[PDB]
Amino acid sequence: ASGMTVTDAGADQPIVFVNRAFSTITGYAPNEVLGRNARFLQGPQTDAATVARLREAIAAARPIQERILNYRKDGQPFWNQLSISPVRDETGNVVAFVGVKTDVTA
Amino acid sequence: ASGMTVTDAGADQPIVFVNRAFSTITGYAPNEVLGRNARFLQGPQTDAATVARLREAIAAARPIQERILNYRKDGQPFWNQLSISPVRDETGNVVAFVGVKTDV
Numbered sequence: 187a188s189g190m191t192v193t194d195a196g197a198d199q200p201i202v203f204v205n206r207a208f209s210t211i212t213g214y215a216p217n218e219v220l221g222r223n224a225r226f227l228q229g230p231q232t233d234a235a236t237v238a239r240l241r242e243a244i245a246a247a248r249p250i251q252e253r254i255l256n257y258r259k260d261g262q263p264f265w266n267q268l269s270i271s272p273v274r275d276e277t278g279n280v281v282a283f284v285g286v287k288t289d290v291t292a
Numbered sequence: 293a294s295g296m297t298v299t300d301a302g303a304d305q306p307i308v309f310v311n312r313a314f315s316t317i318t319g320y321a322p323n324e325v326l327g328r329n330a331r332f333l334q335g336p337q338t339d340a341a342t343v344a345r346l347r348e349a350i351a352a353a354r355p356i357q358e359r360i361l362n363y364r365k366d367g368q369p370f371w372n373q374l375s376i377s378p379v380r381d382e383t384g385n386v387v388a389f390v391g392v393k394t395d396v
């Protein structure tokens with residue numbers, strides 16, 4: 187099961203929804219992540235150039251796929267196969283972003 | 293502002309999330325729609341051909357846009373400029389569907 191996050195499009199893309207697999211993968215309950223930017227999943231071993239490519243894609247509302255080192259709540263690393271896409275209305279306004287997280291550590 | 297719905301991919305695509313604008317447009321609170329298929333928004337004057345196109349698109353996980361007649365909680369009809377797309381993982385498994393609703 188892949189984790190899924192939904193964020194607001196604007197401000198700092200706060201998380202507005204996670205699926206159950208999100209909590210299985212990351213160790214966080216919904217109430218611990220709602221209203222936060224997903225960057226709290228990163229740590230000192232996360233690749234800064236990868237974070238930069240996500241930052242620039244989100245600012246432009248461009249879809250992006252990266253493999254990124256992330257951390258469970260208890261501190262265990264997992265390699266996150268992350269896919270992020272904007273949700274657009276028919277005028278092209280960005281309504282939200284959706285993220286799909288696959289734990290590809292094994 | 294455009295309404296947004298997120299559903300599960302499987303079974304009968306039950307609604308798992310709605311934004312604030314969904315409630316403004318439809319007059320339903322989240323508690324009233326969570327766990328339900330969004331077809332409850334349709335009613336007597338809804339075009340059956342339009343429903344059938346949405347049904348086939350969801351079954352194949354194909355993106356689709358339709359203008360569909362829907363009904364607010366209080367029974368007032370409204371034109372829903374609806375666009376539906378699947379959310380996929382990187383192996384192409386469908387994880388969810390996203391619907392965007394504009395009252396036109």
Ligand SMILES: Cc1cc2nc3c(=O)[nH]c(=O)nc-3n(C[C@H](O)[C@H](O)[C@H](O)COP(=O)(O)O)c2cc1C
Nearest residue numbers: 191193199223224225227228237240241283284285
């Ligand atoms: C919908 C969505 C989901 C995201 N999921 C993750 C994630 O699972 N792991 C992660 O490291 N970053 C994730 N991000 C990226 C961070 O939120 C952030 O955009 C990234 O760290 C780049 O921005 P920054 O330099 O301001 O931190 C996600 C962003 C969005 C919009």
Ligand SMILES: Cc1cc2nc3c(=O)[nH]c(=O)nc-3n(C[C@H](O)[C@H](O)[C@H](O)COP(=O)(O)O)c2cc1C
Nearest residue numbers: 297299305329330331333334343346347389390391
């Ligand atoms: C994410 C999502 C959002 C939807 N939103 C609406 C909507 O706003 N109004 C509507 O009439 N149908 C909506 N539908 C369509 C119905 O849920 C259903 O797929 C359609 O009526 C055709 O299938 P049926 O013949 O089994 O009812 C949505 C479906 C999905 C998957």
